[PDB]
């Protein structure tokens, strides 16, 4: 992952106007609805049978927030992504047994969510820089699978 300083600050400028509260659940939620097999990992969260159910779940909403927090941590340490996400990598490989491929799908949904949210402000060059960040994060998290 190699962002220019221009890319790093734009990413940073945008994320400031981001309310992890709502967006946190929009991303998790949409991950569950759009890639249904992921529901399997969250079976204690309750009902995720319909989009409504999922977009209504308060554990979904609460967990989402926590995830985007973790993500915000990375944005603050863009040069040390791997070291930032080492624990979480270990957790997802050795406790939850998540296939690293799903980290990629996750990065794509967050990107659609940011697009939805910021509309015309999510310009093509802004998406370009977030695509890189998102791949970086997928990679750090898969790091301790190898």
């Amino acid at each position: 992952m190699h962002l220019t300083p221009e890319e790093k600050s734009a990413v940073t400028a945008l994320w400031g106007k981001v309310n992890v509260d709502e967006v946190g659940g929009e991303a998790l939620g949409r991950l569950l609805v759009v890639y249904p097999w992921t529901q399997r990992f969250f079976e204690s969260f309750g009902d995720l049978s319909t989009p409504d159910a999922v977009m209504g779940n308060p554990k979904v909403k609460a967990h989402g927030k926590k995830v985007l927090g973790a993500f915000s941590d990375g944005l603050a340490h863009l040069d040390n992504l791997k070291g930032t996400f080492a624990t979480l990598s270990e957790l997802h490989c050795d406790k939850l047994h998540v296939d690293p491929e799903n980290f990629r799908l996750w990065g794509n949904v967050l990107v659609c969510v940011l697009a939805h949210h910021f509309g015309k402000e999510f310009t093509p060059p802004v998406q370009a820089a977030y695509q890189k960040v998102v791949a970086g994060v997928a990679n750090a998290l898969a790091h301790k699978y190898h």
């Binding site: 249904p36 097999w37 529901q39 399997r40 296939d99 491929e101 799903n102």
Partner: peptide, 11 residues
């Protein structure tokens, strides 16, 4: 495999 097992396609 899809509805009851929820198997991840990558497998």
């Amino acid at each position: 495999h899809a509805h009851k097992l929820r198997v991840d396609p990558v497998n």
